[PDB]
Amino acid sequence: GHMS
Amino acid sequence: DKYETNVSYKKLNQLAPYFKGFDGSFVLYNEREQAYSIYNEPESKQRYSPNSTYKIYLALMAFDQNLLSLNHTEQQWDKHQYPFKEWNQDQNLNSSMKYSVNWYYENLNKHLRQDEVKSYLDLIEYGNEEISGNENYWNESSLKISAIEQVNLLKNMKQHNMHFDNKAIEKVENSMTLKQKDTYKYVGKTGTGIVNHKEANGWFVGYVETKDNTYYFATHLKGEDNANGEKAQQISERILKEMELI
Ligand code: NI
């Protein structure tokens, strides 16, 4: 869930 | 839950008073002298849940898996209300580590397959390497590590013995740098485990890098309550100050  | 090692050490039994109210251990490894010193050797070997001290290695894994990289460690807060103000904001590696922001590390762990984690825990010899427990296997669950092992891992990390990129290691070090002075760099990470609403497991692990040595340390507290990272850190600082390391 960090996205990036 | 015991780490088996026959390593020699200097006993620090005089540190006992610092541990009033706890079954605690303090492990020091003096890099230059290649020497361990330990208060409470039996507890030094007992593996406990790492809680937030796991974040150090989860961060390294995340770098290694390119989840984190250079100029790429931020996570945006989704506006979910946590109990700690510091969690209730956008994060980068430094803030997430300093404030032990679980969701940031949960988000990273989400992209780590169980087998990738197992592979890393094997490579870094992370305690019992047991991650069967909860999804958050690091938090009062299956994964456990001893105080001496916490020191060993810090040492292997800092000495660049671990198969993580050195730049990643430096970034993680920075993220847990508590104090940077001309005379030393003081790095550390707290962890706390709660069971039945009591703080039963407190960690503070890190090292003091001086101009000529590095002193790796791990303090563990077990007690019915109040055994938390903050107290572990307080105790550690008392010891390190008594030792004139900080
Ligand atoms: Ni993610």
Interchain CB distance below 8 Å, B106 and A4: no
User: For residue B109, how far is its CA from the centre of ligand 1 (angstroms)?
Assistant: 8
Torsion of CA B12, B13, B18, B19, to 10 degrees: 120
DSSP per position, B30-42: ETTTTEEEEESHH
Resolution, given in Å to one decimal, reads: 1.8
Chain A residues with beta carbon closer than 8 angstroms to that of B112: none
Each residue of B225-242: b (16+ CB within 10 Å) or e? Answer: eebbbebbbebbbebbee
Q: b or e along B4-29 (b: 16 or more beta carbons within 10 Å of the residue's beta carbon)?
A: eeeeebeebeebeebbeebebbbbbb
Domain ranges of chain B: 1-246
Place of tokens 């990273």: B108
Tell me, in angstroms, the distance from the centre of ligand 1 to residue B154's CA: 26
Give me the amino acid identity at B61. M
Contacts of B226 (CB under 8 A, 6+ apart): B21, B22, B198, B199, B202
Verify whether the Cβ–Cβ distance B110 to A3 is below 8 Å: no
Give me the DSSP letters along B194-240: EETTEEEEEEEEEEEEESS-EEEEEEEEE-SS-B-HHHHHHHHHHHH
Which chain B residues are within 8 Å of A3, Cβ to Cβ? Answer: 75-76
User: Cα(B121)–Cα(B142) distance, rounded to whole angstroms?
Assistant: 13
Pairing, β B23-30 against β B214-222: antiparallel
> Which residues of chain B are at the A interface, by a Cβ-Cβ cutoff of 8 Å?
67, 72, 75-76, 103-104, 106-108, 110-111
The catalytic residue among B25, B44, B49, B52 is B52
Place of tokens 């209730």: B88
**Residue ranges with strand state E in chain B:** 9-11, 23-30, 35-39, 177-180, 184-195, 198-210, 214-222
B141 as an active site residue: the answer is no
Closest CA to B110 of B129, B76, A4, A2: A2
Terminal CA-to-CA distance of chain B, rounded, Å?
32
Backbone torsions φ then ψ of B116, nearest 5 degrees: -70, -45
Q: In what order do the strands lie in the sheet with B9-11?
A: B9-11, B35-39, B23-30, B214-222, B198-210, B184-195, B177-180
Reduced to 3 DSSP states, what percent helix, strand and coil does chain A have, rounded to the nearest 5? 0, 0, 100
- The two beta strands, B9-11 and B35-39, are parallel
The tokens 């958050």 sit on which residue? B136
Distance between CA atoms of residues B218 and B221, nearest Å: 10
On chain A, the residues whose CB falls within 8 A of the CB of B111 are: 2
B-facing residues of A in 1-4 (CB < 8 A) are 1-4
Answer for the pair B190, B100: CB distance below 8 angstroms, yes or no: yes
CA B14 to chain centre: 24
- Nearest chain A Cα to B73, which residue? A4
The architecture in CATH of the region B1-246 reads 3-Layer(aba) Sandwich (3.40)
Q: Give the chain A residue nearest B71 (alpha carbons).
A: A4
The total number of residues shown for chain A amounts to 4
Q: What's the distance, Cα to Cα, between the start and end of chain A in Å?
A: 8
The residue of chain A nearest to residue B66, with distances taken between CA atoms, is A4
